[PDB]
Write a protein that binds this ligand. Sequence first.
Ligand code: FES
Ligand code: FES
Ligand code: FES
Ligand code: FES
Ligand code: FES
Ligand code: FES
Ligand SMILES: [Fe+2]
Ligand SMILES: [Fe+2]
Ligand SMILES: [Fe+2]
Lengths: 388, 388, 388, 104, 104, 112
Amino acid sequence: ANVDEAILKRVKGWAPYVDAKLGFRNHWYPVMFSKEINEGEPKTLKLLGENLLVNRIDGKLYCLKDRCLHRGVQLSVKVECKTKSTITCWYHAWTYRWEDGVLCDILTNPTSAQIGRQKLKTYPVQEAKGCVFIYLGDGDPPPLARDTPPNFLDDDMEILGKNQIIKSNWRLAVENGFDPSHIYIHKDSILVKDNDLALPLGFAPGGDRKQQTRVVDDDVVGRKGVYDLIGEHGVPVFEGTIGGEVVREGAYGEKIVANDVSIWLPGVLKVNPFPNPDMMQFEWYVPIDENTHYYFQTLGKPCANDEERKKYEQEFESKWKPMALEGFNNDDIWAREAMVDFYADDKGWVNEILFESDEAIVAWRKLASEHNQGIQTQAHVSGLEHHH
Amino acid sequence: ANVDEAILKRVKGWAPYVDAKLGFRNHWYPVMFSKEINEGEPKTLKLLGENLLVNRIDGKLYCLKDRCLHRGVQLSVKVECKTKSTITCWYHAWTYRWEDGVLCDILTNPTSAQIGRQKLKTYPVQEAKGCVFIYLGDGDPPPLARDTPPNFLDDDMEILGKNQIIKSNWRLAVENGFDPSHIYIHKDSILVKDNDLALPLGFAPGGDRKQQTRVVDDDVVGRKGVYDLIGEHGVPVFEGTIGGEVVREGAYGEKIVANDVSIWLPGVLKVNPFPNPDMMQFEWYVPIDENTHYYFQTLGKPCANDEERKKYEQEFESKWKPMALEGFNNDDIWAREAMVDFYADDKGWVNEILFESDEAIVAWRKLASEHNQGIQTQAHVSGLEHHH
Amino acid sequence: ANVDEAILKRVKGWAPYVDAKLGFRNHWYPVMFSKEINEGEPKTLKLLGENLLVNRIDGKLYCLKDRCLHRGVQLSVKVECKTKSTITCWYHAWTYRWEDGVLCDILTNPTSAQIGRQKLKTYPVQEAKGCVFIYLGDGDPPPLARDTPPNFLDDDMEILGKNQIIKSNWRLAVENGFDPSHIYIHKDSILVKDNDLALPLGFAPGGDRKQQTRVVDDDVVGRKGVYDLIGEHGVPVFEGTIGGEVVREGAYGEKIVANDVSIWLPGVLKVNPFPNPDMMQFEWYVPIDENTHYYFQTLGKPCANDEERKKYEQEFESKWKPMALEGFNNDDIWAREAMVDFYADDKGWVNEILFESDEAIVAWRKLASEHNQGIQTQAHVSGLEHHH
Amino acid sequence: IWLKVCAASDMQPGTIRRVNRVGAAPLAVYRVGDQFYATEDTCTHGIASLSEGTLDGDVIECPFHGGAFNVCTGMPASSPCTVPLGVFEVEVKEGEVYVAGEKK
Amino acid sequence: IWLKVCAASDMQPGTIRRVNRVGAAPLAVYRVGDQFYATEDTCTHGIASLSEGTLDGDVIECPFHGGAFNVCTGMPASSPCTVPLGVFEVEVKEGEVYVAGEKK
Amino acid sequence: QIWLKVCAASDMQPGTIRRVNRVGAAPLAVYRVGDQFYATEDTCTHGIASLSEGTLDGDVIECPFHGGAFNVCTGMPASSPCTVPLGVFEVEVKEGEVYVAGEKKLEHHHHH
Ligand code: FES
Ligand code: FES
Ligand code: FES
Ligand code: FES
Ligand code: FES
Ligand code: FES
Ligand SMILES: [Fe+2]
Ligand SMILES: [Fe+2]
Ligand SMILES: [Fe+2]
């Protein structure tokens, strides 16, 4: 219950989604790149509103809630890792094992009855393709593949990227990304001209509602998502008109891209091919709190050896990162920021006036509402409550 | 609806006024000077909590709500006026006519069923005496004369002024300006000495309460206001005493100003004559949001020809603006800000301890409560709500 | 009152204390040092949420609420003390007497019926040991000794100190100060080495629950407090271990300190002896508002003559203040701040997981809940509310 | 010493009546059942006329901020009022209401 | 001009049927008790299909944002809807439902 | 030594609680639910509160510190903030005399 019930009652098709202001619990989420955290170098981060600590011990990553069980302070205010396998709160020295969060010692009172009888929350952590994924959920985690778009985990797919904190709720980021008509904001991107892209201004839908998308709920690995098929029956718009007069044209480059776009739970977009005919872009919009998200950008390109990988890395730093990730997606950032006010009071979820291409967004809202693995609430953050 | 009902219940004489923290809807309000907006150069501003856009086309002013109907973004984040008569949202290209706000085109989907079927909110705009007024209301607007003090619109009246944003609710500004006893804060103003003004410290009331003011319930133009008549039968106080000893004196200048002071809806004060025997001051306290207002000051002086206008404009820039509008009224600014905390929680409207000269303020609160044309609510800002 | 009733209902042993977010009314509180308030120079401060003004007249201190009865502005915005015994509001000149707060004159209208019929709130003020105490309460005040720790007022006791504003609720400061096991955060303090102190890392409790403290409610002066006796039957920890391996050692200096620790209402801690075997520390955590408190530190040392006082003065400035009050207590400041988030939503008062040494804190919570002289409420701040 | 207000019959139980006095502050007369009372008409918390308020039993509620007083004792009954109201003597002789020009 | 939509019995009381029209916007036929009404099927506030909404009396509630319309007058009944719905007169004859070809 | 003599079954009214102090060990809490007797550690697993000073409602004991609660029969948490199960101690009545086990029961050699 994160949103006024009066509002939720109004939204029949996707109330769970509108209520998921803090994101969906029980899903895997990338939070940083592997090279950003080294041996015995504890790192702090907030995911789904929860303060966490991640550390690498003997190469393996561990995640502990950054909040001592005693007086609720963050252990990270003054980190004290007195033994390889533990962390000691700086306040009264309650000591926890990184491996299972068990309170194994208390330096201020070695005879305390709490020793061995309390456990600090831990979360599964997995590294894949140079990315650090945390399963922000309870119980045994499902395969990481379930929460990743197709091909991200392919053997030869070399993954490179960038991550940053953006000031907008995660859902605004997701919808902007999967928004078929938002392509209009990218009409002047340096990438369009500098990489000779063909880029429409928008689309004139064709066919019926069901044909605008393809809802995926039959994938064998269990992934749940939606493909944007507006271009299968729709006519792309290359001539923008006002009063029947052409005021703007799309891009007539030779490189064809982004004709395969899909959004997947918990909130990751796959644009293929992009930003080049031989590459793929996968981006996550990870919930940090109700007002911010991690914009986790990755570009994938098949590489057969260290030679090709190095070449790709060099092209990434010199071209793709500055020209695409920044030169193209920077407009998506302020676009997301521009919707904040309208949805900040939760009223935008009621007052928005949608048009045809939004069918794709609606499909996603319904899929997310039906297949998410749980709604994160303030109670999960402060401490679950329940009266006998 | 804007204030705790338990508080409004206690205020039987002017509950609507206390509830009007965002201002009164359906009234004309000045927001800038004509010279501040040129042809084809859209300007942003916030009025009664609403973000607006003003543009000059073929010399005439037009006003559109600065919020796209689609996803609620401000059009002004990236202004795209692709044709003389329209503005295109930078997000998905929904295009609106400045003239009537009609959604006439959508570049991203020329076949959309929304085209011609939606209308962005527009507000009437009128230029008078070099000032830009906006009718922040619904339906056909009344004559501007109804919402302006007597004589402001006189043919020979030359109006010159200054405008700025002040950090206080508009009502605190209004009451301070019409407050008969607040003259005390002006005892050391440079204007008093440099323009040889006679200025008492206050007034010892005379006559009955009914004689303390004169309410105007209707004009040939429907004006609604109150005249402060404390000086009618009151005794000007020139010697301030404590325990019987004189500790302060008023100013014994020769110039007698402020013969008559009156406040009018939606909230504009008229001081005549001021700051000189041959001039008048008209000042608005326009609601921007619940915490701020535009302090729109103007000085008027009848001028028979270009020759007199030129001279006045010279005297205004060289003397009146710096000595009066700033040298005198600057103290009013911090006095308004000083009342913010007491009323910030709405409790000051209950706990205030009024004295005799406040009969003027009470008369204004009742007149405002009885004759305002509507209470602006947060719902007007986000979108009116009504459940069947 | 100040906390959600569902939470108070859960805390059966000290609900009043949890509800006392704004502090306890009807107790004396130190707010500054005598040397900080000079003759005829009114000084501002906020105590228990209330803005106050303190002035010195003929050497005597007087305290008036810094809020005019008329329109609720702070008189301090522009102080006008026109005669020795009064203060005149800068707005409409309502004049109040410092000794009884009576509205004795109004310069803007000397014939007002309000004159002599209204009274601005005043609070008792007393100077002791060069410290200014204000009785933030109603009715004749109890003797100051009731709200001070034993010996603070000793004739031979020379008091020197420091005061500053800290960003945390007063209760967090109190509990941190009386917390037996928090001594762990002081293990690396420069005072430990530089003053050759003996200091354990914690304590292994001994004896029964009641033996852990000495609750004082039999004090002749009426003082209400608790003594921490964890050291009488407990074994001090000088070797901290994890998995049986020593990872940290306490300090084996020669100077024995802090063997006598007590907390007293309204919230003052006494540490004896500290920071040196021949001194004592007395510190208050005075509520300013729900999020801040004055950390009023004072060190006492018996002195028989001016020579001893001057020597102590020199030592305080060159050693005690920088090495102890700062070098030692600075870690207490950020430790308090570290608990803010957990208790900010009042949920920490339910979710905290205590261990043995917290018995002292529990005793304090119960004593405070049972012996406080009143719960300050926001209504006290804005203006008491009661319906017939 | 006394002033003529009205006939007891003119006032229905639970009603208030303002009494303007030449060269002096106005008073308020309240009929509570069959007994009449009188106090200053001006609320002690400001400048409101209590005769324009609402009478509930023997408690008068000020129209300005909702403060209230007991019309018999003149003592504050509801915040924000704190200063006692002046009470004037009333006596009904010969089916007519009279109020003491001076307060008790 | 009229369009033969279906048999009255093809619709259970309180249900809605979407009527597609080639080269034109679809309509929504509502069965309120034993009465039949019709309007454009697309909510005027967006792209929702009113035929997938909830009927309460003679008021259709949009499934998207809870906006609503009176299916008899087509006038908005609940926010955020503000643009009146197009209404088509309906007539039942011999157990068959017919809807006017053009708004009225 | 396996069974500790507590008191006479008649010394306890239905719905009451009694604390049992043990030398060199943590105290136990014996609860009478109707005519059946149950026992758990006396110290609340969420802190240092004495459950024998709490409130018994049917077969659920509510801690006086923070309002957490446990089922006295299974020792399982019944109300937040409690999350750690209480150690349970078997109780038996021989000759009208109440006895409590000196060792808590375990998920050892019992129902699967
Ligand atoms: S807050 Fe961490 S050990 Fe006390
Ligand atoms: S938000 Fe303006 S066209 Fe979409
Ligand atoms: S606000 Fe102080 S005299 Fe009016
Ligand atoms: S003037 Fe009567 S309650 Fe304020
Ligand atoms: S689309 Fe129908 S109420 Fe919004
Ligand atoms: S100590 Fe029992 S509920 Fe917290
Ligand atoms: Fe984009
Ligand atoms: Fe002024
Ligand atoms: Fe400390």
